[PDB]
Ligand binder design. Sequence first.
Ligand code: AMP
Ligand code: CL
Ligand code: CL
Ligand code: CL
Ligand code: CL
Length: 273
Amino acid sequence: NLYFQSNAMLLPTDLSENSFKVLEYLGDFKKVGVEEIGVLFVINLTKLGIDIDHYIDEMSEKAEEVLPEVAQKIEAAGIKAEVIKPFPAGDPVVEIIKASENYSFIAMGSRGASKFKKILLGSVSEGVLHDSKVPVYIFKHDMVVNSLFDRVLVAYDFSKWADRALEYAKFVVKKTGGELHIIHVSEDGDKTADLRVMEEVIGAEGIEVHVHIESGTPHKAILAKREEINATTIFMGSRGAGSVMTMILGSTSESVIRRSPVPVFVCKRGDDE
Ligand SMILES: Nc1ncnc2c1ncn2[C@@H]1O[C@H](COP(=O)(O)O)[C@@H](O)[C@H]1O
Ligand SMILES: [Cl-]
Ligand SMILES: [Cl-]
Ligand SMILES: [Cl-]
Ligand SMILES: [Cl-]
């Protein structure tokens, strides 16, 4: 495959500070092949007591003041920028997913809300993560700019989603010369032997790889590992099962993504999907 190679990247924004964190990593994305970024602002009608055409207009004017700054910063990094127009009005989650059919992946922010606040107030990032078919990359902080793919940690369970997460990971580590780290969590249903074998095969493929077997709650073991080896990003897979509600309440990805100090890339389909 081409992975990030010649990628168009979808960048949703509600103009919030958290939505712009992605922009601190433009150098990292350029170095893996991202060549164009589509910037998507949605007039959020979902929330709606007040007239809903002055609102489209209020919102449109705000975007037009700010988005050119976004476009500017992208151009300055030597990446093509397109402010998507006209601005869709409706549900941000639906409009983002709709638009994403035209892109290789989605890079977006999150306010890092607790499970409770996500449920109470809504979470665009969880909605997107739940239904997206392209990968979704969540950025909250700038702790690892210029180092994004130096130490990639892959949460890996042999599933088709993890498999493709591993392949993206191998791609970036090959591009940037970093280190690949693979963690698999499980009490048993022992797959240690196979994982060890893969460490060896991947080493032979010219990549520096370290495999980690761990016990306990998945999100706990994953974050603990990230700290232990100072991973610069976490790659993982998600089948997006159940409902948004169910994902928020009990998914491994919601917890990992929420408490992670580094960006989390989430693969949303297998190679043969
Ligand atoms: N009206 C909107 N238009 C475009 N993107 C949005 C909008 N609202 C939220 N988002 C995206 O959702 C992220 C926040 O995720 P969350 O905190 O889970 O709602 C923001 O950083 C944006 O990337
Ligand atoms: Cl795992
Ligand atoms: Cl978990
Ligand atoms: Cl979050
Ligand atoms: Cl982050």
